[PDB]
């Protein structure tokens, strides 16, 4: 009942690498994933794969828990962890079959990890010029939106560029929470735009198109028949007693909307449905009524202006209301939306509205937009850029093998295997593009031998050659490559450190 | 029903006949081409023979199936017709059956497939014969020198390709003789390739004549002779015997002595009749007596002893002389004057290192020569001799048959475009028969691309992209006669590379493969007893 | 399963969706019987009707359903054209998958061959507006004639061709299929099919009220109700049980004043005619005959749904809410005797965008065969006035694209040659299935059609009437170019969503 007992901890992580190796790159394949609520979904993002695939082996859960740390401090390269650290554990199995101990590979990996953190600042070619221009920003964002939505990057690189420039004067406060995404059904991606302030997809149900009131109250309860918090035994016998309750319901709701006018609040948000007679009372006292059925659309407004959602039927409470500058309506893309604009304030809220005919298609654009904001959320720190497309993966594999050859002793075996694990990432890019991977690696090492740096893969099915990444405009993030190498090495050293797994009762 | 076996009919015998025939094509799929892979031929005894030649594969392949037994006989119709081509018939006809098997499932009767294949075959010979090349360009214009240089690249001789390709080009054009009504062919016998140690491989010389690897022995006899008479004989001038197994009886001791004095006296009589003819070139297989060599250094006859028998058959064919087996003419002893003698011009004993050779010049009818492969050791000389023999047969088999065709995938790629446009001109339930005939011819570059370690979807499609432009517009910017260089993995022109194939190996391959695909497609019922 | 065999499991689930709508291609296609869980049978030849009722459980098969779900909402039909075209794109590249070709190379050549299909169609599409100096009324009479050809009304096909071109003229620029109604009543000859400019119903109201109720009205107030005005009604009754014998007179009188006060609110609103889904009793038709009011009950709700849109009113269940805000208006209100039955209809509405076409005949199969051809003939003459740049139907544009994508494939080296060359044979499913669904010989027609396209035939297609080939551009069988573009781009996009999928992830639930 025991065969190897050290190989089964690695084979569980090799299956986790295979679910994202073919899904790597701009030529990567999509995944037909099934939601837990029985919903069909088509995506190719690496973070949405692990969220739905409930992996159960705890040896492969270390790389998944490393992906949750990969989502922190950087929003770039979750697929880089599942490919590179998967190639670390696959190449480490060739050393253990010879007779090498597992503790010798551990100290040899941490030696080559600190050596790879010194060669990576030497490969920084360009940097951002901090001009806050749409030509400088969209030139670097065109590589990050690639490998998410290929072919439609010409419309996505300009829209997120117009959102992040409006936040860059607010220095030290740029984040992904300031740029929100609201999806509106429409024609396609060509009709999409970008707006300022908080934009919701639902229009104002009332007849007010513009109001300058600051007091905003949110009530999650729908507009229906009022129920007393006490017992409240209400009995009806005849038709005249039913009309006394029907007219008395409208008369009490007339005093309910009058309490909103007494506190000086002309903006009300209702989570549930609104009755037709209660909608007439809101338009009488010039009150803007916006219906928001989504709970995440209601929770977004409490964390911005402070207006809380109360369960009671319109309570006149002055303490739990929010504050905004100007709430109005705007007609963009043949659809009226509500804008929570900040006129007196300088403003740091931007909303990118996305249009599309398929909800399964518009959700993949939302993961491509939030990964585009997270590329420049990293660039609020020290600006360093590295060439992409497998350009840095060969030069880092060239210097480590040159370093491990000159170093004598038993530690030269784990350093040489640390460089060949970087070769799997151009092997993942060449295989997904329909090109023989053994020819591109030989074409990459032949041009890097002569000193022609910044050379990556030519993205073409018919051309197995290479091209320059500096003239092509392909650039990655150095901090995106810095935390990816450190977290994948710390994850792959954790799986090799654990030998056997024993179940225990609580 | 009570019969003497099992009966099976319908389309299930059509699908079983094409699966048994295409499985034989997989036996000769990887072995196609000059880079073909070896395959193990397991015998019933237990030993195995490693052969890569496809003609020897189908001879030893024994599959007890009647569908596979049909493809066994076409190997006998291929060597008896031309002598080459064999496995190219098998891959074409099996892919012809596999595409026709898809037509049976597509509600097409095979009668339209059989009549459509014969019209597709006859139009294939018409498009080939309209795009041929006459056997010419022997001197002055290269598609030759470069033709034999590709065959010479696999060995160590390919470092200096231009030096050794000139030795085989002028040797092929030297052995040309019509001999029947203006045929000219090339014989199975060729130049004799000798070797020596001439301190490097660059000291090879193109000798315009046969060179004998024998040493004349004595030095007092002169090595330069002017007379033309050449004598060849097989009987020994040494002491003769009756038989190796039958002997004569000798009883008296003095009787033994007088037959040795008679042997010394009858050697004086035979040398009087040989030198009376004036023949100085004396070549003897059985050896020359020691006192008989004394008479040759004073008369000036160039006597060579211990000559090989197979070397003397090319010498007597050179000067037109007759080989004399016995000197006794059934009652006495004569030399057969003016019968066993030829004519020549000059025989020089050239000083070659480690083997002083005998060269003959301007004989009666020889047309042969010799190449002295001077080198450094026996390793580089033995590998260069088989490289000259392999480069000789490449230029020989091309320049025989009276016209040639640029082959190596250039024939079938051009036929895949013309026969498709011809298929759209006929109709009448045979368009799909000719359109699948064009796609079935594409397996010849398809198996050649997978054996050349290249992408088969790119290398075959690069052949059809160039051959389509020859049919669209007749402008010279269209690449014409584009062959397939399997070494570099890039298509080139066959006229510049010199890759040529005979027409009779290309015509009879398309003729035999369609007649073999017709016979298997006509099988609709199986009867066993 | 990731790689090659996951694509084979998705390429076999594509066949079971195409086979459900393979035989329904063409007007003479075979019908399908789909039975739900309740036990009702549904016979339809429409491809959108079958795919809505299948509800397939396979995840790779749900992609081709949702593409046809987007097609019926925008274009209107042609769900079997985008299904067989997207299916045949996969069956040609299926032997290329096992060879080792990457599925991204299938994507890169599908985006190229689709863009060549758009440029070839727009260069070959001819705008037919006033060709050969003909009237536009005669052009729709010829194109609707081929839709009714080889049918049961071929004896009077010239009369039925004039009926479709008159119904499309009475509407505005906003043309739709659901605005036209088709009624099926039994009796009469075949040539007695009249036309109604507005909404008409069968009018099964056979209660009392004769020698009154004038059928002529200039501007009446159309009342739309759902109330019952019967004496033995289920909602208007009174049952009071007592011993008092003078109260016995009161319970019969107060039961009458319940119906009388509900009838008094009708005349107080000023409604000239009243309509109701529930039947109307004889004492309510007697009350309207005394006050000179028209009444006609027992009308269907679907006939009322086309009436409230045209008259400009709305349906109100109760009689208390009857006022001038919900009363409809019209200009012509007459009464006919078509087929011996009474027929009420309105003509000259301010929102007159709906009509009704009554059919006559001696057999019900002579009527249901026509209404399948009538709805197709309506959408043909709707597409003719909408899109002027049209091409020949019947597989004529598919055989021309198979010629253009074949010789261009031989000019492109690489992996795109053997794929786009297979893309040309994948477009042959439209003229091939037109022969097998019509019962012809698919071998002799397609071999004659491809031989005609090489000699110069650019508008020849498959004739569904005869077993011949004919120029469908000259035979007035047309299809718009923009629908053929939208059917080709949706077929390659649906074929892309099956090829690009490489692994299926199922959450454990
Ligand atoms: N078109 C391209 N040209 C050059 N390099 C590319 C291209 N596309 C991807 N890459 C390379 O792929 C790696 C990042 O690719 P990718 O966009 O798949 O990661 P990611 O999807 O952003 O990660 P995450 O899953 O966290 O979003 C980089 O090393 C980059 O060099
Ligand atoms: N010089 C050349 N360059 C490129 N291809 C060549 C050349 N010579 C031959 N070929 C290819 O090699 C193939 C010949 O294969 P091979 O010699 O292994 O068997 P074969 O001769 O076809 O069998 P058989 O003797 O029955 O005909 C031909 O199809 C031809 O296309
Ligand atoms: N009279 C005809 N002759 C030949 N082919 C026809 C004829 N009518 C229709 N077709 C074929 O039927 C196909 C259209 O099928 P179908 O009628 O189900 O869709 P549609 O109603 O035209 O589309 P839509 O839903 O956009 O109106 C076309 O591709 C055409 O080739």
- Counted across chains B and C, CB pairs separated by less than 8 A come out at 58
- How crowded is residue A443: how many other Cβ atoms within 10 Å of its Cβ? 18
- Shortest distance between the Cα of A196 and any Cα of chain C, in A, equals 32
**Rounded to an integer, what distance in angstroms lies between the CA atom of residue B229 and that of residue A166?**
110
Contact with chain A for residue C236, Cβ under 8 A: no
Pocket lining for ligand 3, CB < 6 angstroms:
C 25-27, 47, 75-78, 80-81, 146, 379, 393-395, 430, 434, 464, 477, 483
Instruction: Classify residue A229 by its DSSP letter.
Output: S
Residue C233 — φ and ψ, nearest 5°? -80, 160
**Rounded to an integer, what distance in angstroms lies between the CA atom of residue C355 and that of residue C341?**
19
**Rounded to an integer, what distance in angstroms lies between the CA atom of residue B239 and that of residue B270?**
13
What tokens does B194 get? Answer: 């000798």
Radius of gyration, alpha carbons of chain C: 29
- β-strand partners of C187: C361
Q: Is B87 a catalytic residue?
A: yes
Specify whether the CB–CB gap between C43 and C32 falls below 8 A.
Answer: yes
- β-strand partners of B527: B7
**Rounded to an integer, what distance in angstroms lies between the CA atom of residue B100 and that of residue B436?**
8
| Candidate of C28, C78, C80 to mutate for ligand 3, largest count of ligand atoms within 8 Å of Cβ | C78
Count of helices and strands (H, E) across chain A: 17, 18
Specify whether the CB–CB gap between A308 and A316 falls below 8 A.
Answer: no
Q: Is B516 exposed, middle or buried (0-12, 13-18, 19+ CB in 10 A)?
A: buried
Tokens 């197979």 -> residue: B310
- How crowded is residue B215: how many other Cβ atoms within 10 Å of its Cβ? 13
CB contact under 8 A, B468 and C407: yes
CB contact under 8 A, B468 and C413: no
Residue C389 — φ and ψ, nearest 5°? -80, 100
Q: Which atom of ligand 1 is nearest to the CA of A28?
A: 18
| CATH number of residue C181's parent domain | 3.30.260.10
- How crowded is residue A306: how many other Cβ atoms within 10 Å of its Cβ? 13
- How crowded is residue A71: how many other Cβ atoms within 10 Å of its Cβ? 13
Specify whether the CB–CB gap between C109 and C423 falls below 8 A.
Answer: yes
Q: Is C376 a catalytic residue?
A: yes
**Sign of the CA dihedral with A44 first, then C492, A38, and C6 last:** negative
Radius of gyration, alpha carbons of chain A: 29
**Rounded to an integer, what distance in angstroms lies between the CA atom of residue A110 and that of residue A106?**
7
- How crowded is residue A113: how many other Cβ atoms within 10 Å of its Cβ? 19
Q: Which of B424, B432, B455 sits opposite C454 (nearest CB)?
A: B424
Strands A215-219 and A267-270: parallel
Span A197-347 CATH architecture: 3-Layer(bba) Sandwich (3.50)
- Domain containing C313 equals 200-383
Residues 6+ apart with CB under 8 A from C161: C141, C142, C144, C145, C148
- Shortest distance between the Cα of A50 and any Cα of chain C, in A, equals 10
**Rounded to an integer, what distance in angstroms lies between the CA atom of residue B118 and that of residue B511?**
9
Q: Which of C3, C497, C505 sits opposite A49 (nearest CB)?
A: C505
**Rounded to an integer, what distance in angstroms lies between the CA atom of residue C332 and that of residue C324?**
19
Burial C61-82 (b: 16+ CB within 10 A, else e): bebbbebbeebbeebebbbbbb
C373 is in an annotated binding site: no
Nominal resolution (angstroms):
4.2
Domain limits of chain A?
6-127+384-503, 128-196+348-383, 197-347
Establish how many alpha carbons lie within 13 A of residue C384's alpha carbon, considering only the half-sphere containing its beta carbon: 27
DSSP-assigned letters across all residues of C308-365: HHHHS---BSSSTT-STTT-B--SEEEEE-GGGS-EEEEE--TT---EEEEE-BS-SH
Specify whether the CB–CB gap between B433 and B116 falls below 8 A.
Answer: yes
What tokens does B240 get? Answer: 């003769």
Residues 6+ apart with CB under 8 A from B152: B158, B161, B164, B165, B387, B390, B391
The distance of Cα B302 from the centroid of its chain, to the nearest Å, equals 36
**Rounded to an integer, what distance in angstroms lies between the CA atom of residue C428 and that of residue C25?**
13
Residue C491 — φ and ψ, nearest 5°? -75, -35
Q: What residues of A are in contact with residue C507 (Cβ under 8 Å)?
A: 33-36, 52-54
Residue A199 — φ and ψ, nearest 5°? -115, 125
Q: Write out the H or E segment, with its range, that includes residue B23.
A: helix B12-27
DSSP-assigned letters across all residues of B218-285: -SSS-S-B----EEEE-S-SS---S-SS------SHHHHHHHHHHHHHHHHHHHHHHTTTT--EEEES
Instruction: Classify residue C234 by its DSSP letter.
Output: S
**Rounded to an integer, what distance in angstroms lies between the CA atom of residue B316 and that of residue B283?**
10
Tokens 């050179």 -> residue: B318
Specify whether the CB–CB gap between C429 and C84 falls below 8 A.
Answer: yes
Strands A288-291 and B7-9: unpaired
CA dist B39 → B34, B87, B118, B471 (Å): 14, 14, 34, 40
Task: Please tell me chain B's helix, strand, coil percentages from 3-state DSSP, rounded to the nearest 5.
Answer: 45, 15, 40
Residues 6+ apart with CB under 8 A from C290: none
Instruction: Classify residue C129 by its DSSP letter.
Output: S
B33 is in an annotated binding site: yes
Specify whether the CB–CB gap between A34 and A473 falls below 8 A.
Answer: no
Q: Is C46 a catalytic residue?
A: yes
Of 1.10.560.10, 3.40.50.2300, 1.10.10.10, 3.40.50.12500, the CATH number of A6-127+384-503 is 1.10.560.10
Catalytic residue among B38, B43, B53, B170: B53
CA dist B130 → A113, B133, B414 (Å): 68, 9, 12
Tokens 């028209």 -> residue: C294
**Rounded to an integer, what distance in angstroms lies between the CA atom of residue C34 and that of residue C53?**
7
CB contact under 8 A, A18 and C104: no
A456 lines ligand 1 (CB under 6 A): yes
CB contact under 8 A, B431 and C454: no
What tokens does B478 get? Answer: 């269209």
Q: Which of A170, A157, A180 is nearest to A375 (CA)?
A: A157
Method: cryo-EM
Specify whether the CB–CB gap between C143 and C477 falls below 8 A.
Answer: yes
Q: Is C380 exposed, middle or buried (0-12, 13-18, 19+ CB in 10 A)?
A: buried
Q: Write out the H or E segment, with its range, that includes residue A237.
A: none
- β-strand partners of B195: B373
The residue whose CA is least distant from atom 17 of ligand 1 is A147
Q: Which of C418, C442, C447 sits opposite B427 (nearest CB)?
A: C447
**Sign of the CA dihedral with B420 first, then B422, B424, and B427 last:** negative
A370 lines ligand 1 (CB under 6 A): no
Q: Which of A19, A42, A461 sits opposite C105 (nearest CB)?
A: A461
- How crowded is residue B191: how many other Cβ atoms within 10 Å of its Cβ? 24
| Superfamily for the A128-196+348-383 domain | TCP-1-like chaperonin intermediate domain (3.30.260.10)
The distance of Cα B318 from the centroid of its chain, to the nearest Å, equals 22
Tokens 């690496």 -> residue: A46
Radius of gyration, alpha carbons of chain B: 31
Q: Is B162 a catalytic residue?
A: no
Q: Is B216 exposed, middle or buried (0-12, 13-18, 19+ CB in 10 A)?
A: middle
In this structure, the dihedral spanned by the alpha carbons of residues C118, C123, C129 and C132, taken in order and rounded to 10 degrees, is -140
CB contact under 8 A, C442 and B424: no
Contact with chain A for residue C55, Cβ under 8 A: no
| Shortest-distance ligand to the CA of residue C80 | 3
Specify whether the CB–CB gap between B492 and B485 falls below 8 A.
Answer: yes
Instruction: Classify residue A338 by its DSSP letter.
Output: E
Question: Chain C residue with minimal CA distance to B109?
Answer: C443
Q: Which of A333, A337, A350 is nearest to A161 (CA)?
A: A350
Same domain for C340 and C206: yes
SS3 labels along B62-83: CCCCHHHHHHHHHHHHHHCCCC
Measured in Å, residue A155 CA sits from the centre of ligand 1 at: 19
The CATH number of the domain covering residues in B206-400: 3.50.7.10
CB contact under 8 A, A461 and C104: yes
Catalytic residue among C24, C63, C80, C83: C80
- How crowded is residue B234: how many other Cβ atoms within 10 Å of its Cβ? 17
Same domain for C289 and C180: no
Instruction: Classify residue A204 by its DSSP letter.
Output: B
**Sign of the CA dihedral with C62 first, then C66, C67, and C72 last:** positive
Q: What residues of C are in contact with residue A43 (Cβ under 8 Å)?
A: none
The distance of Cα B91 from the centroid of its chain, to the nearest Å, equals 23
Residues 6+ apart with CB under 8 A from A244: none
Measured in Å, residue A144 CA sits from the centre of ligand 1 at: 7
């Amino acid at each position: 009942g025991l065969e190897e007992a050290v190989y089964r901890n690695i084979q569980a992580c090799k299956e986790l690498a295979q679910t994202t190796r073919t899904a790597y790159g701009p030529n990567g394949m999509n995944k037909m994933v099934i939601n837990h609520l029985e919903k069909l979904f088509v995506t190719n993002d690496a973070a949405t794969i692990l969220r739905e695939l409930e992996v159960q082996h705890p040896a492969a859960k270390m790389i998944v828990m490393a992906s949750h740390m990969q989502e922190q401090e950087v929003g770039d390269g979750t697929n880089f962890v599942l490919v590179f650290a998967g190639a670390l554990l696959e190449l480490a199995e060739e050393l253990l079959r010879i007779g090498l101990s597992v503790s010798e590979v551990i100290e040899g990996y941490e030696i080559a990890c600190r050596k790879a953190h010194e060669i990576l600042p030497n490969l920084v070619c360009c940097s951002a010029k901090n001009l806050r221009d749409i030509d400088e920003v969209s030139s670097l964002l065109r590589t990050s939106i690639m490998s998410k939505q290929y072919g439609n990057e010409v419309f996505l690189a300009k829209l997120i560029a117009q959102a992040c420039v409006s936040i860059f004067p607010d220095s030290g406060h740029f984040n992904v929470d300031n740029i929100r995404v609201c999806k509106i059904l429409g024609s396609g991606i060509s009709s999409s735009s970008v707006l300022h302030g908080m934009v919701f997809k639902k229009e104002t149900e009332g007849d007010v198109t513009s109001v300058k009131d600051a007091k905003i109250a949110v009530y999650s309860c729908p507009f229906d028949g009022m129920i007393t918090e006490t017992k409240g035994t209400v009995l009806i016998k005849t038709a005249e007693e039913l009309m006394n309750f029907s007219k008395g319901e409208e008369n009490l709701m007339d005093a309910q909307v009058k309490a909103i006018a007494d506190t000086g609040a002309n903006v009300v948000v209702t989570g549930g449905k609104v009755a037709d007679m209660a909608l007439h009372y809101a338009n009488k006292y010039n009150i803007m009524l916006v219906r928001l059925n989504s709970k995440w659309d209601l929770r977004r407004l409490c964390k911005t202006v402070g207006a809380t959602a109360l369960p009671r039927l319109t309570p006149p409470v002055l303490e739990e209301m929010g504050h905004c500058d100007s709430v109005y309506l705007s007609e963009v893309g043949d659809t009226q939306v509500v804008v929570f604009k900040h006129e007196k304030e300088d403003g740091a809220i931007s909303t990118i509205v996305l249009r599309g005919s398929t909800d399964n298609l518009m959700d993949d654009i939302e993961r491509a937009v939030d990964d585009g904001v997270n590329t420049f959320k990293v660039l609020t720190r020290d600006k360093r850029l590295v060439p992409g497309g497998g350009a840095t993966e060969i030069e880092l594999a060239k210097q480590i093998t040159s370093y491990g050859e000159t170093c004598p002793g038993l530690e030269q075996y784990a350093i040489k295997k640390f460089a060949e694990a970087f070769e799997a990432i151009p092997r993942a890019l060449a295989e997904n593009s329909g090109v023989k991977a053994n020819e591109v690696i030989s074409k990459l090492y032949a041009v890097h031998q002569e000193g022609n740096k910044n050379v990556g893969l030519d993205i073409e099915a018919e051309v197995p050659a290479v091209k320059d990444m500096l003239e092509a405009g392909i650039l990655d993030t150095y901090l995106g490559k810095y935390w990816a190498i450190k977290l994948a090495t710390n994850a792959a050293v954790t799986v090799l450190r654990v030998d056997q797994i024993i179940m225990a009762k609580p | 029903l009570s019969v003497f076996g099992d009966r099976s009919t319908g389309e299930t015998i059509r699908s079983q006949n094409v699966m048994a025939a295409a499985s034989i094509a997989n036996i000769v799929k990887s072995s196609l081409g000059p880079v073909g892979l070896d395959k193990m031929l397991v015998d019933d005894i237990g030993d195995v023979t490693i052969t890569n030649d496809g003609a020897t594969i189908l001879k030893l392949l024994e599959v007890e199936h009647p569908a596979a037994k049909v493809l066994c006989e076409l190997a006998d119709l291929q060597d008896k017709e031309v002598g080459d081509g064999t496995t190219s018939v098998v891959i074409i006809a099996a892919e012809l059956l596999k595409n026709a098997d898809e037509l049976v499932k597509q509600k097409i009767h095979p009668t339209s497939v059989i009549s459509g294949y014969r019209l597709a075959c006859k139009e294939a010979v018409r498009y080939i014969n309209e795009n041929l090349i006459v056997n010419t360009d022997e001197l002055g214009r290269d598609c030759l020198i470069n033709a034999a240089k590709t065959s010479m690249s696999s060995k160590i001789i390919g470092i200096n390709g231009d030096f050794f390709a000139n030795m085989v080009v002028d040797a092929v054009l030297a052995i040309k003789y019509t001999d029947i009504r203006g045929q000219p062919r090339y014989p199975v016998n060729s130049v004799n390739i000798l070797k020596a140690h001439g301190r490097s491989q660059m000291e090879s010389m193109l000798i315009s004549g046969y060179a004998l690897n024998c040493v004349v022995g004595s030095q007092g006899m002169p090595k330069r002779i002017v007379n033309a008479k050449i004598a060849c004989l097989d009987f020994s001038l040494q002491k003769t015997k009756m038989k190796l197994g039958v002997q004569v009886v000798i009883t008296d001791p003095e009787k033994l002595d007088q037959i040795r004095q008679r042997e010394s006296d009858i050697t004086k009589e035979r040398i009087q009749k040989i030198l009376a003819t004036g023949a100085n070139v004396i070549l003897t297989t059985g050896g020359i007596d020691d006192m008989c060599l004394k008479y040759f250094v004073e008369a000036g006859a160039m006597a060579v002893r211990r000559v090989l028998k197979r070397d003397l058959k090319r010498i007597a064919k050179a000067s037109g002389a007759t080989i004399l087996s016995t000197l006794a003419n059934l009652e006495g002893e004569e030399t057969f004057e003016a019968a066993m003698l030829g004519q020549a011009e000059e025989v020089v004993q050239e000083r070659i290192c480690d083997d002083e050779l005998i060269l003959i010049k301007n004989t009666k009818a020889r047309t042969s020569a010799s190449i002295i492969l001077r080198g450094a050791n026996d390793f580089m000389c033995d590998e260069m001799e088989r490289s000259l023999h392999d480069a000789l047969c490449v230029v020989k088999r091309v320049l025989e048959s009276k016209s040639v065709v640029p082959g190596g995938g250039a024939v079938e790629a051009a036929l895949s475009i013309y026969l498709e446009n011809y298929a759209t001109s006929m109709g009448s339930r045979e368009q799909l028969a000719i359109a699948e005939f064009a796609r079935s011819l594409l397996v010849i570059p398809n198996t050649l691309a997978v054996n050349a370690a290249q992408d088969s979807t790119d290398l075959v499609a690069k052949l059809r992209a160039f051959h389509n432009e020859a049919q669209v517009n007749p402008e010279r910017k269209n690449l014409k006669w584009i062959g397939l260089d399997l070494s570099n993995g890039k298509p080139r022109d066959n006229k510049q590379a010199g890759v040529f194939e005979p027409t009779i190996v290309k015509v009879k391959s398309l003729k035999f493969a369609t007649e073999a695909a017709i016979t298997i497609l006509r099988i609709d019922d199986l009867i066993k007893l | 399963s990731q790689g090659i065999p996951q694509l084979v499991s998705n390429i076999s689930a594509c066949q079971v969706i195409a086979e459900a709508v393979r035989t329904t291609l063409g007007p003479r296609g075979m019908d399908k019987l789909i039975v739900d869980g309740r036990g009702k049978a549904t016979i339809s030849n429409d491809g959108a009707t079958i795919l809505k009722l299948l509800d397939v459980v396979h995840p790779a098969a749900k992609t081709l359903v949702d593409i046809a779900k987007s097609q019926d909402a925008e274009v209107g039909d042609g769900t079997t054209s985008v299904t067989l075209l997207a299916a045949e794109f996969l069956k040609q590249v299926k032997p290329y998958v096992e060879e080792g070709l990457h599925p991204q190379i299938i994507i890169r050549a599908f985006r190229t061959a689709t863009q060549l299909a758009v440029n070839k169609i727009k260069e070959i599409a001819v705008t037919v507006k006033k060709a050969d100096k003909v009237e536009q009324r005669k052009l729709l009479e010829k194109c609707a004639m081929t839709a009714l050809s080889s049918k049961l009304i071929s004896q009077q096909k010239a009369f039925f061709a004039k009926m479709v071109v008159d119904a499309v003229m009475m509407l505005d620029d906003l043309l739709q299929l659901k605005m036209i109604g088709i009624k099926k009543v039994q009796g009469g000859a075949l040539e007695d099919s009249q036309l109604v400019a507005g909404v008409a119903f069968k009018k099964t109201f056979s209660y009392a009220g004769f020698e009154m109720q004038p059928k002529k009205y200039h501007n009446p107030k159309i009342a739309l109700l759902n109330v019952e005005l019967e004496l033995k009604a289920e909602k208007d009754n009174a049952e009071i049980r007592v011993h008092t014998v003078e109260d016995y007179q009161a319970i019969v009188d107060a039961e009458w004043n319940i119906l009388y006060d509900k009838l008094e609110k009708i005349h107080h609103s000023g409604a000239k005619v009243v309509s109701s889904k529930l039947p109307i009793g004889d004492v309510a038709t007697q009350y309207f005959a005394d006050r000179d009011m028209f009444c006609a009950g027992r009308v269907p709700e679907e006939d009322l749904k086309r009436t409230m849109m045209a008259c400009g009113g709305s349906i109100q269940t109760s009689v208390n809410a009857l006022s001038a805000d919900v009363l409809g208006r019209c200009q012509v209100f007459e009464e006919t005797q078509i087929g011996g039955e009474r027929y009420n209809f309105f003509t000259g509405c301010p929102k007159a965008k709906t009509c009704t076409f009554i059919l006559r005949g001696g057999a019900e199969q002579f009527m249901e065969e026509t209404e399948r051809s009538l709805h197709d003939a309506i959408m043909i003459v709707r597409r003719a006035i909408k899109n002027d740049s049209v091409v020949a139907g019947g597989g004529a544009i598919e055989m021309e694209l198979s010629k253009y994508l074949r010789d261009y494939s031989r000019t492109i080296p690489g992996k795109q040659q053997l794929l786009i060359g297979a893309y040309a044979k994948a477009l042959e499913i439209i003229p091939r299935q037109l022969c097998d669904n019509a019962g012809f010989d698919a071998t002799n027609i397609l071999n004659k059609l491809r031989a005609r396209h090489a000699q110069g035939g650019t508008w020849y297609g498959v004739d569904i009437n005869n077993e011949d080939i004919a120029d469908n551009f000259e035979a007035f069988v047309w299809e718009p170019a923009m629908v053929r573009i939208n059917a080709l781009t949706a077929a390659s996009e649906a074929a892309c969503l099956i090829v690009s999928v490489d692994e299926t992830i199922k959450n454990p639930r």
